[PDB]
Amino acid sequence: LTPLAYKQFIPNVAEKTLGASGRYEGKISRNSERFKELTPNYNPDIIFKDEENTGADRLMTQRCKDKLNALAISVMNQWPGVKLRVTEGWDEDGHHSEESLHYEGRAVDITTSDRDRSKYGMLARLAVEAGFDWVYYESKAHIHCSVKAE
Amino acid sequence: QVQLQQSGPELVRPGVSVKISCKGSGYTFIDEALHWVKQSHAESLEWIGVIRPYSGETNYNQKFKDKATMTVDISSSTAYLELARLTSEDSAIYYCARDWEAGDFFDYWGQGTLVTVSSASTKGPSVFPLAPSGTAALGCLVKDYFPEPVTVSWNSGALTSGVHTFPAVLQSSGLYSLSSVVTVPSSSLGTQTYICNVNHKPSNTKVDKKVEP
Amino acid sequence: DIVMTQTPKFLLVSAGDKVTITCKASQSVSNDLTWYQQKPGQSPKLLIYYASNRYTGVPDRFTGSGYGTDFTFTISTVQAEDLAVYFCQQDYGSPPTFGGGTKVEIKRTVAAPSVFIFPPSDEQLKSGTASVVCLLNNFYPREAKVQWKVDNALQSGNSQESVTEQDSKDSTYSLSSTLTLSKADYEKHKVYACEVTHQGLSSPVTKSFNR
Ligand SMILES: [Ca+2]
Ligand SMILES: [Ca+2]
Ligand SMILES: [Cl-]
Ligand SMILES: [Zn+2]
């Protein structure tokens, strides 16, 4: 296992290509029919920042939940006493790129529970091994992970 | 609503330390890192450092290693910046600013704390009416103060349309002076009260000047 | 430390026109490039991050591009309320560093100042000093000549001027000229006059009072 380099994306293609997580299908708002296709994640071994205090960060697609749950396990295994942490899941704050996969629940921004930025390269490596369809060392403060639609 | 509320302006001698503060509200204080940014004429914007309230970890710009200490009081949701052994190069606006854990850049800024490093004495202004005589101007002359800044409102913030508060000028005496004016309807003069509310925090000078025809 | 060079330093621009600002880094900063807008009297406001993402609610007219050293910030169609200093900031390297800034000033049609004169207050005269103030309200452009006359004699060396920042709505300036005398000297003269020359006035406008 080698940590991803700063700004490295795996696989080596645009996020929204067929080879990656594939195309933006559209924004999901709290009204929408599609809102109901979002599972809240209550895995007790995942820290959700939820600074919004709405629980938005827990909402994601089935596929996102699955990869996130797998990564939760490999993070506890990688560092004794550390957990996966989510800063963003589904988003209604418009805090992303114009057509973020966050706006339809197909992306998470992640850290370790200790916010040790030296761990974050290895964290991205784990998110690839967990089966995220696109991993990106997006900033010094987070790894962005996304998934194909259902 | 996220707000960073900074402490008031400071006059200090060269050689003395000063400690300024920044209180975070409208969010959970330990959720975000806090940064300190200096704005001078000499050097425009410069990053001093960051403190992580959650861990109390700090990282300093090496330029400020010897000058700056950051601390937090998690209980009052307040960050502090202490600047030691000051010279005139330390005179500037100091901001605190918050990131949103997406990189070391800042969506929320304090209003800024003006630190004047000087050996000059504080002096509060005198405030004189600029008496009015379709449209009528009137105002208040805020003369002979030190240091900057001074604030001026009208009728306790109730009058803002048509107000112009001039940047201070430095007199030959080394004291500042400025005017604040406001235009208003002429018909209003007999009827409406107009008071300028002048605040010079470094001398604890506050003045309400009633301005009448 | 990474040096950010921002150009141009100043731009004058009419409502509806394009603004283009460049920032170049002394070494690559990938896309870790932020653009702030600092309006007069305010703290910086973040418009663009990761070189090209608009912060929430930032209008369409603002854009960024670039990767490596060379970054571009555009206002497609500048509006009156966009006057500000724009700064870039890199956070690829430690420490983070800012550009020296670009000041954007609005060019608009000519507007003549309204002129007003204020005698010294009795309160101030008991103190031994006399300030006489001349106000030029809401004019464009910034160039104006204010001449003090005391019993028709042109004054020099005994006034200071101050100019407001450009208004965010009408893009005009205001100007204050203060004439300062001793009580002694003030009381020796009768006619106090503020004479104003400006592009928007056919001839100089005088306002005056008799002490
Ligand atoms: Ca969140
Ligand atoms: Ca969010
Ligand atoms: Cl995104
Ligand atoms: Zn993301």
Coordinates of C-alpha atoms and ligand atoms in Angstrom, one line a residue:
Chain A
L1 CA 0.0 0.0 0.0
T2 CA 1.5 3.4 -1.1
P3 CA -0.2 6.7 0.0
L4 CA -1.6 8.8 -2.9
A5 CA 0.5 11.9 -3.8
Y6 CA -1.0 15.4 -3.3
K7 CA -3.6 16.2 -6.1
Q8 CA -3.3 12.5 -7.4
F9 CA -6.6 11.0 -8.6
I10 CA -7.2 7.2 -9.1
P11 CA -8.2 6.1 -11.6
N12 CA -6.2 8.6 -13.8
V13 CA -9.3 10.0 -15.7
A14 CA -11.9 12.7 -15.1
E15 CA -14.2 11.9 -12.2
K16 CA -17.3 12.0 -14.4
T17 CA -16.0 9.7 -17.2
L18 CA -17.4 6.1 -17.7
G19 CA -14.0 4.7 -16.3
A20 CA -14.4 6.7 -13.1
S21 CA -17.7 7.5 -11.2
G22 CA -19.5 8.5 -14.5
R23 CA -21.8 11.3 -15.3
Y24 CA -23.6 13.9 -13.2
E25 CA -27.3 12.8 -13.3
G26 CA -28.5 16.0 -11.6
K27 CA -28.9 17.9 -8.2
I28 CA -31.0 16.2 -5.5
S29 CA -32.8 18.8 -3.2
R30 CA -34.6 17.9 0.1
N31 CA -38.1 18.2 -1.8
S32 CA -37.2 15.9 -4.7
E33 CA -38.6 12.4 -5.3
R34 CA -34.9 11.2 -5.6
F35 CA -34.3 12.5 -2.0
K36 CA -35.9 9.2 -0.8
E37 CA -33.1 7.1 -2.6
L38 CA -30.7 8.4 0.1
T39 CA -29.7 6.1 3.1
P40 CA -28.5 8.0 6.2
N41 CA -25.3 6.2 7.4
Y42 CA -25.3 5.6 11.3
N43 CA -22.2 3.4 11.4
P44 CA -21.0 4.0 15.0
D45 CA -17.3 3.8 13.8
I46 CA -17.7 6.8 11.3
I47 CA -17.4 10.4 12.7
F48 CA -19.7 12.8 10.8
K49 CA -18.7 16.5 11.2
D50 CA -22.3 17.7 10.6
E51 CA -21.3 21.4 11.2
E52 CA -24.6 22.1 9.3
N53 CA -26.4 20.4 12.2
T54 CA -29.0 18.9 9.7
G55 CA -27.5 15.3 9.4
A56 CA -26.9 16.1 5.6
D57 CA -23.4 14.6 5.8
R58 CA -24.8 11.2 6.7
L59 CA -27.0 11.1 3.6
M60 CA -25.5 9.2 0.6
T61 CA -26.4 6.6 -2.1
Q62 CA -26.4 2.8 -1.4
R63 CA -23.1 2.3 -3.2
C64 CA -21.5 5.2 -1.3
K65 CA -22.6 3.8 2.1
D66 CA -21.1 0.4 1.1
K67 CA -17.7 1.7 0.1
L68 CA -17.7 4.1 3.2
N69 CA -18.6 1.1 5.5
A70 CA -15.7 -0.9 4.0
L71 CA -13.2 2.0 4.4
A72 CA -14.4 2.5 8.0
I73 CA -13.1 -1.0 8.8
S74 CA -9.7 -0.6 7.0
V75 CA -9.1 2.8 8.7
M76 CA -9.5 1.2 12.3
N77 CA -7.1 -1.6 11.1
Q78 CA -4.6 0.9 9.6
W79 CA -4.1 3.0 12.9
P80 CA -4.9 1.8 16.4
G81 CA -7.5 4.1 18.0
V82 CA -8.4 6.1 14.8
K83 CA -11.7 6.2 12.8
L84 CA -12.9 7.4 9.4
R85 CA -14.3 11.0 9.5
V86 CA -16.7 12.5 6.9
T87 CA -16.8 16.4 6.5
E88 CA -19.3 16.4 3.6
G89 CA -21.7 13.8 2.2
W90 CA -24.8 14.9 0.4
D91 CA -24.7 18.7 0.3
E92 CA -27.4 21.4 -0.1
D93 CA -25.0 24.4 1.0
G94 CA -23.6 24.7 -2.6
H95 CA -20.0 24.3 -1.1
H96 CA -18.7 22.3 -4.1
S97 CA -17.9 22.6 -7.8
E98 CA -20.9 23.6 -10.0
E99 CA -22.1 20.0 -10.6
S100 CA -20.6 18.1 -7.6
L101 CA -21.4 14.4 -7.1
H102 CA -22.0 15.7 -3.5
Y103 CA -25.3 17.3 -4.8
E104 CA -26.7 13.8 -5.6
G105 CA -25.2 11.9 -2.7
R106 CA -22.4 10.2 -4.6
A107 CA -19.4 11.7 -2.9
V108 CA -17.8 12.1 0.5
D109 CA -15.0 14.3 1.8
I110 CA -13.0 12.4 4.4
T111 CA -10.2 12.7 7.0
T112 CA -9.1 10.6 9.9
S113 CA -10.7 11.3 13.3
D114 CA -7.5 12.7 14.6
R115 CA -7.2 15.3 11.5
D116 CA -3.5 14.2 11.1
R117 CA -2.9 15.5 7.6
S118 CA 0.2 13.2 7.3
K119 CA -2.2 10.2 7.3
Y120 CA -4.3 11.5 4.4
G121 CA -2.3 10.1 1.5
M122 CA -2.6 6.6 3.1
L123 CA -6.4 7.4 3.8
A124 CA -6.9 7.9 0.0
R125 CA -5.0 4.6 -0.7
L126 CA -7.5 2.9 1.7
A127 CA -10.5 4.5 -0.1
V128 CA -9.3 3.1 -3.5
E129 CA -8.8 -0.4 -1.9
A130 CA -12.4 0.0 -0.3
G131 CA -13.7 0.2 -3.9
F132 CA -14.4 4.0 -4.3
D133 CA -14.9 4.5 -8.1
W134 CA -12.8 7.9 -7.9
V135 CA -10.4 9.0 -5.2
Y136 CA -8.7 12.5 -5.3
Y137 CA -6.2 14.1 -2.8
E138 CA -8.3 17.3 -3.4
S139 CA -6.8 19.6 -0.6
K140 CA -4.4 19.4 2.3
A141 CA -7.4 19.1 4.5
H142 CA -9.5 16.3 2.8
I143 CA -9.7 13.3 0.4
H144 CA -12.7 13.5 -2.0
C145 CA -14.2 10.0 -2.8
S146 CA -17.1 9.3 -5.2
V147 CA -19.1 6.4 -6.7
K148 CA -21.1 5.4 -9.8
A149 CA -24.8 5.9 -9.7
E150 CA -27.3 3.0 -9.1
Chain B
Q1 CA -24.7 33.0 11.3
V2 CA -20.9 32.5 11.7
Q3 CA -19.2 35.7 13.1
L4 CA -15.6 36.5 14.2
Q5 CA -15.7 39.4 16.6
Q6 CA -12.3 41.1 17.2
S7 CA -11.2 43.3 20.1
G8 CA -10.8 47.1 19.7
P9 CA -8.0 49.2 18.4
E10 CA -4.7 49.4 20.4
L11 CA -2.0 52.0 20.8
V12 CA 1.3 50.6 22.2
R13 CA 4.9 51.7 22.6
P14 CA 7.7 50.1 20.6
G15 CA 9.2 47.4 23.0
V16 CA 5.8 46.5 24.7
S17 CA 3.7 43.4 23.9
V18 CA -0.1 43.5 23.0
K19 CA -2.6 40.7 23.0
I20 CA -5.7 41.0 20.8
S21 CA -8.7 38.6 20.7
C22 CA -11.2 37.1 18.3
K23 CA -14.4 35.5 19.5
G24 CA -16.2 32.9 17.3
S25 CA -20.0 32.7 17.3
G26 CA -22.7 30.8 15.3
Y27 CA -20.6 27.6 15.1
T28 CA -19.0 25.0 17.3
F29 CA -15.6 26.6 18.1
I30 CA -13.5 23.3 17.8
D31 CA -15.0 22.4 14.3
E32 CA -12.7 25.0 12.5
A33 CA -9.0 26.1 12.5
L34 CA -8.4 29.9 13.1
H35 CA -5.8 31.9 11.2
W36 CA -4.2 35.3 11.8
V37 CA -3.6 37.6 8.8
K38 CA -1.7 41.0 9.0
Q39 CA -2.7 43.9 6.6
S40 CA 0.0 46.7 6.4
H41 CA 0.7 49.4 3.7
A42 CA 4.4 48.0 3.6
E43 CA 3.6 44.2 3.0
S44 CA -0.2 44.1 2.1
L45 CA -1.6 40.7 3.3
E46 CA 0.6 38.2 5.1
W47 CA -0.4 34.9 6.9
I48 CA 0.9 34.9 10.5
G49 CA -0.2 31.4 11.5
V50 CA -3.0 28.9 12.4
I51 CA -4.2 27.4 15.7
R52 CA -6.4 24.3 15.8
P53 CA -8.8 24.8 18.7
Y54 CA -9.6 21.0 18.7
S55 CA -5.9 20.0 19.5
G56 CA -4.4 23.4 20.4
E57 CA -1.8 22.6 17.7
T58 CA -0.1 25.8 16.2
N59 CA 1.9 26.5 13.0
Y60 CA 3.7 29.8 12.5
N61 CA 4.9 31.6 9.5
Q62 CA 8.7 31.5 10.3
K63 CA 8.7 35.4 9.6
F64 CA 6.5 35.7 12.9
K65 CA 8.1 32.8 14.9
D66 CA 9.8 35.2 17.4
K67 CA 7.0 37.9 17.3
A68 CA 3.6 36.0 17.6
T69 CA 2.0 33.6 20.1
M70 CA -1.5 32.1 19.3
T71 CA -3.7 30.6 22.1
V72 CA -7.4 29.8 22.5
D73 CA -9.8 29.7 25.4
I74 CA -12.2 27.0 24.2
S75 CA -14.7 27.9 27.0
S76 CA -15.3 31.5 25.7
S77 CA -14.8 30.4 22.1
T78 CA -12.0 33.1 21.9
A79 CA -8.6 33.0 20.0
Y80 CA -5.8 35.3 21.1
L81 CA -2.8 36.8 19.3
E82 CA 0.0 38.1 21.4
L83 CA 2.7 40.3 19.6
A84 CA 5.9 40.8 21.6
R85 CA 8.8 43.4 21.3
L86 CA 6.9 45.6 18.8
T87 CA 8.4 48.1 16.3
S88 CA 6.7 50.5 13.9
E89 CA 6.7 47.6 11.3
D90 CA 4.1 45.9 13.5
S91 CA 1.5 48.8 12.9
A92 CA -1.3 47.2 10.8
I93 CA -4.8 45.7 10.7
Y94 CA -4.7 42.2 12.2
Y95 CA -7.6 39.8 11.2
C96 CA -8.6 36.4 12.4
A97 CA -10.2 34.2 9.7
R98 CA -11.7 30.7 9.5
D99 CA -11.2 28.0 6.9
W100 CA -13.9 25.4 6.3
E101 CA -11.5 22.4 6.2
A102 CA -11.2 22.6 2.4
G103 CA -7.7 24.1 2.4
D104 CA -5.9 27.0 4.1
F105 CA -8.1 29.8 2.7
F106 CA -10.8 31.8 4.5
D107 CA -14.6 32.3 4.0
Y108 CA -15.1 34.2 7.4
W109 CA -13.0 37.1 8.6
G110 CA -13.1 39.3 11.7
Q111 CA -13.6 43.0 11.2
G112 CA -9.9 43.5 12.0
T113 CA -8.0 45.1 14.9
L114 CA -5.9 48.2 14.1
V115 CA -2.7 48.1 16.2
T116 CA -0.7 51.4 16.2
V117 CA 2.9 51.0 17.5
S118 CA 4.0 54.5 18.5
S119 CA 5.5 56.5 21.3
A120 CA 2.8 59.2 20.9
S121 CA 0.2 59.8 23.7
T122 CA -3.5 58.9 23.1
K123 CA -5.8 62.0 22.8
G124 CA -9.6 62.0 22.4
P125 CA -11.1 64.3 19.8
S126 CA -13.1 67.5 20.3
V127 CA -16.4 67.3 18.3
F128 CA -17.8 70.5 16.8
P129 CA -21.1 71.0 14.8
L130 CA -21.1 71.7 11.0
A131 CA -24.3 73.7 11.2
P132 CA -26.8 73.4 8.3
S133 CA -27.7 76.7 6.5
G134 CA -34.4 70.9 -1.4
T135 CA -31.1 69.7 0.2
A136 CA -29.2 70.7 3.3
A137 CA -25.8 69.5 4.4
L138 CA -24.8 69.3 8.0
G139 CA -22.1 67.4 9.9
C140 CA -19.6 67.1 12.7
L141 CA -15.9 68.0 12.8
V142 CA -13.9 65.4 14.8
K143 CA -10.7 67.3 15.5
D144 CA -7.3 66.6 17.2
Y145 CA -7.2 62.9 18.1
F146 CA -4.6 60.1 18.3
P147 CA -4.3 57.3 17.3
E148 CA -6.7 56.1 14.5
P149 CA -9.4 55.0 14.4
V150 CA -12.6 56.9 15.2
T151 CA -16.2 55.8 14.3
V152 CA -19.1 58.1 13.5
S153 CA -22.8 57.2 13.3
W154 CA -25.8 59.4 13.0
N155 CA -28.8 59.3 15.3
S156 CA -27.4 56.0 16.8
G157 CA -27.2 54.2 13.4
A158 CA -30.8 55.2 12.4
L159 CA -29.5 57.7 9.7
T160 CA -27.3 56.2 7.1
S161 CA -28.7 57.5 3.6
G162 CA -26.4 60.4 2.2
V163 CA -23.7 60.0 5.1
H164 CA -20.0 60.6 4.1
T165 CA -17.4 60.2 6.8
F166 CA -14.1 61.4 5.3
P167 CA -10.8 59.6 5.9
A168 CA -8.8 61.3 8.6
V169 CA -6.0 63.7 7.7
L170 CA -2.8 64.0 9.8
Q171 CA -2.3 67.6 11.0
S172 CA 1.2 69.2 11.3
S173 CA 0.6 68.7 15.1
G174 CA 0.6 64.9 14.6
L175 CA -3.0 64.7 15.6
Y176 CA -5.8 63.4 13.2
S177 CA -8.9 65.2 12.2
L178 CA -11.9 64.3 10.1
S179 CA -15.4 65.4 9.2
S180 CA -18.7 63.5 8.9
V181 CA -21.5 65.1 6.9
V182 CA -25.0 64.1 5.8
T183 CA -27.3 65.7 3.4
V184 CA -31.0 65.8 4.4
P185 CA -34.1 67.6 3.3
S186 CA -34.3 71.3 4.2
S187 CA -38.0 70.9 5.4
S188 CA -36.7 68.3 7.9
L189 CA -34.4 70.9 9.7
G190 CA -37.1 72.5 12.0
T191 CA -38.5 69.0 12.9
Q192 CA -35.8 66.3 12.9
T193 CA -33.0 66.0 15.5
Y194 CA -29.6 65.1 14.1
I195 CA -26.8 63.9 16.5
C196 CA -23.4 62.5 15.5
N197 CA -22.2 59.6 17.8
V198 CA -18.4 59.7 17.8
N199 CA -16.4 56.9 19.5
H200 CA -12.5 57.1 19.9
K201 CA -11.9 53.8 21.8
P202 CA -8.1 54.3 22.6
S203 CA -9.0 57.4 24.8
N204 CA -12.4 56.1 26.0
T205 CA -13.9 59.2 24.4
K206 CA -17.6 58.9 23.3
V207 CA -19.4 62.1 22.2
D208 CA -23.1 62.7 21.1
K209 CA -23.1 66.1 19.4
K210 CA -26.5 67.6 18.6
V211 CA -26.2 69.6 15.4
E212 CA -28.9 72.4 15.0
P213 CA -29.4 75.1 12.3
Chain C
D1 CA 8.3 30.9 0.3
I2 CA 6.2 31.3 -2.8
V3 CA 6.0 34.9 -4.2
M4 CA 2.7 35.8 -5.9
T5 CA 3.0 38.7 -8.5
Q6 CA -0.4 40.3 -9.3
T7 CA -0.9 42.5 -12.3
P8 CA -2.0 45.1 -13.1
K9 CA -1.8 47.1 -9.8
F10 CA -4.7 49.4 -10.9
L11 CA -7.6 49.3 -13.4
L12 CA -10.1 52.0 -14.3
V13 CA -13.2 50.4 -15.9
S14 CA -16.7 51.5 -17.0
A15 CA -19.8 49.5 -15.9
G16 CA -20.4 46.6 -18.4
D17 CA -16.6 46.2 -19.3
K18 CA -14.3 43.2 -18.7
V19 CA -11.6 43.2 -15.9
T20 CA -8.7 40.7 -16.3
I21 CA -6.2 40.2 -13.4
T22 CA -3.2 38.0 -13.5
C23 CA -1.4 36.3 -10.7
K24 CA 1.9 34.4 -11.3
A25 CA 3.6 32.3 -8.6
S26 CA 7.4 31.9 -8.4
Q27 CA 6.8 28.1 -8.6
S28 CA 3.8 25.8 -9.3
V29 CA 1.0 25.9 -6.7
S30 CA -1.2 23.3 -8.7
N31 CA -4.8 24.7 -8.3
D32 CA -4.5 25.9 -4.7
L33 CA -5.3 29.5 -5.7
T34 CA -8.0 31.7 -4.0
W35 CA -9.3 35.1 -5.1
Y36 CA -10.7 37.6 -2.5
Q37 CA -12.6 40.9 -3.0
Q38 CA -11.9 43.6 -0.4
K39 CA -14.5 46.4 -0.6
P40 CA -13.6 49.8 1.0
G41 CA -13.8 49.6 4.8
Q42 CA -14.5 45.8 4.8
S43 CA -12.7 42.6 5.4
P44 CA -11.8 40.4 2.5
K45 CA -14.6 38.2 0.9
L46 CA -13.7 34.9 -0.8
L47 CA -15.0 34.7 -4.4
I48 CA -13.1 31.8 -6.0
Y49 CA -11.2 28.8 -4.6
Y50 CA -9.2 25.8 -6.2
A51 CA -8.4 28.5 -8.9
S52 CA -11.9 28.2 -10.6
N53 CA -14.7 27.2 -8.1
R54 CA -17.2 30.0 -7.3
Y55 CA -18.0 30.2 -3.6
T56 CA -21.8 29.9 -2.9
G57 CA -23.8 32.9 -4.1
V58 CA -20.9 34.5 -6.0
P59 CA -22.4 35.8 -9.3
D60 CA -21.7 34.4 -12.8
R61 CA -19.6 37.4 -13.9
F62 CA -16.7 36.2 -11.7
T63 CA -14.4 33.4 -13.0
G64 CA -10.9 32.1 -12.4
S65 CA -8.6 29.7 -14.4
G66 CA -5.1 28.3 -14.3
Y67 CA -2.9 25.5 -12.9
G68 CA 0.8 25.7 -12.0
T69 CA 2.2 29.3 -11.8
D70 CA -0.2 31.3 -14.1
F71 CA -3.8 32.2 -12.9
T72 CA -6.4 34.5 -14.4
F73 CA -9.4 36.3 -12.6
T74 CA -12.1 37.8 -14.8
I75 CA -15.2 39.9 -14.2
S76 CA -17.0 39.4 -17.5
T77 CA -19.3 42.5 -17.0
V78 CA -18.0 44.7 -14.1
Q79 CA -20.8 46.4 -12.1
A80 CA -20.7 49.7 -10.0
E81 CA -20.7 47.6 -6.7
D82 CA -17.6 45.6 -7.8
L83 CA -15.1 48.4 -6.9
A84 CA -12.6 46.7 -4.5
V85 CA -9.0 45.5 -4.2
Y86 CA -8.8 41.9 -5.5
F87 CA -6.1 39.6 -4.1
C88 CA -4.9 36.1 -4.9
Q89 CA -3.6 33.7 -2.3
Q90 CA -1.8 30.4 -2.8
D91 CA -2.0 27.7 -0.2
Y92 CA 0.1 25.0 -2.0
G93 CA 3.3 25.9 0.0
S94 CA 3.7 26.8 3.7
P95 CA 3.3 29.6 4.5
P96 CA 0.3 30.6 2.5
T97 CA 1.1 33.9 0.6
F98 CA -1.0 36.7 -1.1
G99 CA -0.5 38.9 -4.1
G100 CA -0.1 42.7 -3.5
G101 CA -3.6 43.3 -4.9
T102 CA -5.4 45.0 -7.9
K103 CA -7.6 48.1 -7.3
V104 CA -10.6 48.3 -9.6
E105 CA -12.1 51.8 -9.9
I106 CA -15.3 52.6 -11.8
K107 CA -15.3 55.2 -14.7
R108 CA -18.7 56.8 -15.1
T109 CA -20.1 60.0 -16.7
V110 CA -19.1 63.5 -15.4
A111 CA -21.0 64.8 -12.3
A112 CA -20.6 68.3 -10.8
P113 CA -20.2 68.6 -7.0
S114 CA -22.8 70.3 -4.9
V115 CA -20.9 72.8 -2.8
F116 CA -21.5 73.8 0.8
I117 CA -19.5 75.9 3.3
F118 CA -19.6 75.7 7.2
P119 CA -18.4 78.5 9.5
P120 CA -16.5 77.6 12.7
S121 CA -18.7 76.7 15.7
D122 CA -18.9 79.2 18.6
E123 CA -17.8 76.2 20.7
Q124 CA -14.6 75.9 18.7
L125 CA -13.9 79.7 18.7
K126 CA -13.9 79.8 22.6
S127 CA -11.1 77.2 22.3
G128 CA -8.9 79.7 20.2
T129 CA -9.0 77.9 16.8
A130 CA -11.3 78.4 13.8
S131 CA -11.9 75.5 11.2
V132 CA -13.9 76.5 8.1
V133 CA -15.1 73.5 6.1
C134 CA -16.0 73.3 2.4
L135 CA -17.9 70.2 1.2
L136 CA -18.0 68.9 -2.4
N137 CA -20.7 66.2 -2.6
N138 CA -21.1 63.4 -5.1
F139 CA -19.0 64.4 -8.1
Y140 CA -16.9 62.6 -10.8
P141 CA -14.2 62.6 -11.7
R142 CA -12.0 62.9 -8.5
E143 CA -9.9 65.9 -9.9
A144 CA -11.2 69.2 -8.4
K145 CA -9.5 72.5 -7.4
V146 CA -10.8 74.0 -4.0
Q147 CA -9.4 77.6 -3.4
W148 CA -9.9 79.4 -0.1
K149 CA -10.4 83.2 -0.2
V150 CA -10.4 85.4 2.9
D151 CA -11.6 89.0 2.1
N152 CA -10.8 88.0 -1.6
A153 CA -7.2 86.9 -0.8
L154 CA -6.1 83.5 -2.1
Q155 CA -4.9 81.3 0.8
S156 CA -2.1 78.7 0.7
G157 CA -0.5 76.4 3.3
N158 CA -3.4 76.6 5.8
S159 CA -5.9 74.0 4.4
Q160 CA -6.0 70.2 4.1
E161 CA -8.4 68.1 1.9
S162 CA -9.8 64.6 2.3
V163 CA -11.6 62.5 -0.4
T164 CA -14.0 59.6 0.2
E165 CA -13.7 56.2 -1.5
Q166 CA -15.8 55.9 -4.6
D167 CA -19.4 55.2 -3.8
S168 CA -20.5 51.6 -4.5
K169 CA -23.8 52.7 -6.1
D170 CA -23.3 56.0 -8.1
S171 CA -19.5 55.7 -8.4
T172 CA -19.1 59.4 -7.3
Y173 CA -16.5 60.9 -4.8
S174 CA -17.0 63.5 -2.0
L175 CA -14.3 65.9 -0.8
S176 CA -13.8 67.9 2.4
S177 CA -11.4 71.0 2.5
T178 CA -10.7 72.4 6.0
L179 CA -9.2 75.9 6.4
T180 CA -7.6 76.4 9.9
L181 CA -6.8 79.8 11.4
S182 CA -6.2 81.1 15.0
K183 CA -9.3 82.8 16.5
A184 CA -7.2 86.0 16.4
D185 CA -6.7 85.8 12.6
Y186 CA -10.2 84.6 11.8
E187 CA -11.7 87.6 13.6
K188 CA -9.6 90.1 11.5
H189 CA -11.5 89.1 8.3
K190 CA -15.1 89.3 7.1
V191 CA -15.6 87.2 3.9
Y192 CA -14.9 83.5 3.8
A193 CA -15.2 81.8 0.4
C194 CA -14.7 78.4 -0.9
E195 CA -14.1 78.5 -4.8
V196 CA -14.4 75.2 -6.7
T197 CA -13.3 74.3 -10.2
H198 CA -14.3 71.0 -11.7
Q199 CA -14.8 69.4 -15.1
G200 CA -18.6 69.4 -14.5
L201 CA -18.9 73.2 -13.8
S202 CA -18.9 75.7 -16.8
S203 CA -17.2 78.3 -14.4
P204 CA -15.9 78.0 -10.8
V205 CA -18.7 77.9 -8.1
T206 CA -18.1 80.0 -4.9
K207 CA -19.9 79.6 -1.6
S208 CA -19.2 82.2 1.2
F209 CA -20.4 83.7 4.5
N210 CA -19.5 87.1 6.3
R211 CA -18.2 86.5 9.9
Ligands
CA1 CA -20.6 19.0 6.4
CA2 CA -22.4 20.7 3.3
CL3 CL -16.7 18.3 -5.6
ZN4 ZN -15.8 16.3 -2.3

